[PDB]
């Protein structure tokens, strides 16, 4: 394992050092998005929750293609405001239900240390 706790105050500093292989060692799902919602990184734990193959969704748009159940003011809406503002740090519960058994999760969205990249962290609840 990579020991990093979900919701940690400095998590963006910690994950700045990880290559895709290290992200696969986290205890929770991790997705890196650009400012347009395109998927830059997607880890193994996220594929285990949603059944998506990580290598197959890199490059796709999260909100438009992969995860349209998040295309809502409660999720996408918060993301877009955060990108527009250049600051994002929010946690909420959500249900993932697109082409899968409905799965209640905790979502943590946070701006990355780098310019135009954003993290989505996910864990089961
Ligand atoms: C809502 O769209 C649920 C499905 C889904 C699929 C993949 C990811 O990563 C999140 C949500």
Domains of the chain: 1-125 (3.30.450.20)
Q: What is the resolution of this structure in A?
A: 1.6
Q: Is the CB of 75 under 6 A from ligand 1?
A: no
Residue 68 Cα to ligand 1 midpoint, Å, equals 7
| E strand map for 1-125 | 29-34, 39-42, 89-96, 103-111, 117-124
Mutate to test the pocket of ligand 1, among 70, 79, 99 (most ligand atoms within 8 A of CB): 70
- The experimental technique behind this entry is X-ray
Chain position carrying tokens 């290290």:
22
Q: How far apart are CA 54 and CA 75, in angstroms?
A: 21
Q: How far apart are CA 92 and CA 101, in angstroms?
A: 20
Cα dist. 111→15, 30, 50 in Å? 12, 13, 22
DSSP secondary structure letter of residue 101: -
Residue 96 Cα to ligand 1 midpoint, Å, equals 6
Cα dist. 74→15, 80, 108 in Å? 25, 11, 13
């Amino acid at each position: 394992m990579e020991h990093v706790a979900f919701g940690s105050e400095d998590i963006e500093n910690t994950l700045a050092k990880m290559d895709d292989g290290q992200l696969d060692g986290l205890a929770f799902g991790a997705i890196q998005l650009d400012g347009d919602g395109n998927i830059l990184q997607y880890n193994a734990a996220q594929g285990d929750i949603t059944g998506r193959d990580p290598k197959q969704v890199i490059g796709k748009n999260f909100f438009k293609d992969v995860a349209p159940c998040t295309d809502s003011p409660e999720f996408y809406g918060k993301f877009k405001e955060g990108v527009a503002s250049g600051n994002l740090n929010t946690m909420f519960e959500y249900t993932f239900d697109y082409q899968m058994t409905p799965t209640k999760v905790k979502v943590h969205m946070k701006k990355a240390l780098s310019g135009d990249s954003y993290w989505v962290f996910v864990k089961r609840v």
